[PDB]
């Protein structure tokens, strides 16, 4: 006979994924950072080497806070949290930040305007792309199995130089292992370090 008179609930699967990601990086000595979702343009763009008149901003991708020219917005990624952490802490800094982020995409089967992002930042003496790849590979093993790894191939972001797009080798399934575009990475741009 059924015995469950207090039916079980569920934490959200995104939240649990974030939880698993956070535990993965904690277990490597990193720390979690958090910050506001309504953020200053200073931290969300200008400190990230991404000025007013650069090709693109929020004519097409950012929610802006009223009124026009208030330099407030809903953050479009969690980097401003990383930027706050760099101001507030002593170096070296090894930091994961996971949070709600906002883009002006219509909700369909493969896009959501309200989404959740994970970002990492390692700032130390002597860090290289080699270290970037090791972190990315550890992260992929945690979320995709011991057979997983990453490849990087050049791209462009204003806050990194070199910049690359990250593909993950998803072995465990997909109905037959294939590369899948995962996210993006790069070495922190010197203008971000000065700011």
């Amino acid at each position: 006979l059924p015995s469950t008179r207090v039916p079980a609930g569920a934490r959200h699967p995104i939240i649990m994924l974030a939880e698993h990601v956070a535990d993965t990086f904690i277990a490597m000595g990193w720390e979690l950072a958090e910050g506001p979702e309504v953020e200053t343009e200073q931290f969300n763009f200008d400190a990230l080497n991404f000025p007013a008149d650069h090709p693109a901003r929020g004519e097409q991708d950012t929610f802006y806070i009223a009124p026009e020219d208030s330099r407030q917005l809903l953050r479009t990624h969690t980097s401003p949290v990383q930027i706050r952490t760099l101001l507030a802490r002593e170096l070296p800094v090894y930091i994961i930040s996971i949070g709600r982020t906002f883009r002006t995409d219509e909700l369909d089967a493969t896009h959501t305007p309200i989404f959740h992002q994970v970002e990492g930042l390692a700032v130390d003496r002597g860090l290289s792309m080699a270290h970037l790849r090791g972190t990315l590979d550890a992260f992929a093993r945690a979320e995709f199995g011991p057979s997983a790894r990453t490849r990087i191939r050049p791209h462009f972001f204003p806050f990194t130089e070199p910049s690359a797009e990250v593909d993950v080798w998803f072995a465990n399934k997909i109905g037959g292992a294939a590369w899948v575009e995962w996210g993006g990475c790069g070495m922190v741009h010197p203008n971000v370090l000065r700011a």
Partner: peptide
């Protein structure tokens, strides 16, 4: 970029 090795960094006691 494929020639760049995968090297875990030592992260400090968190």
């Amino acid at each position: 970029l494929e020639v760049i090795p995968s090297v875990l960094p030592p992260a400090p006691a968190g």
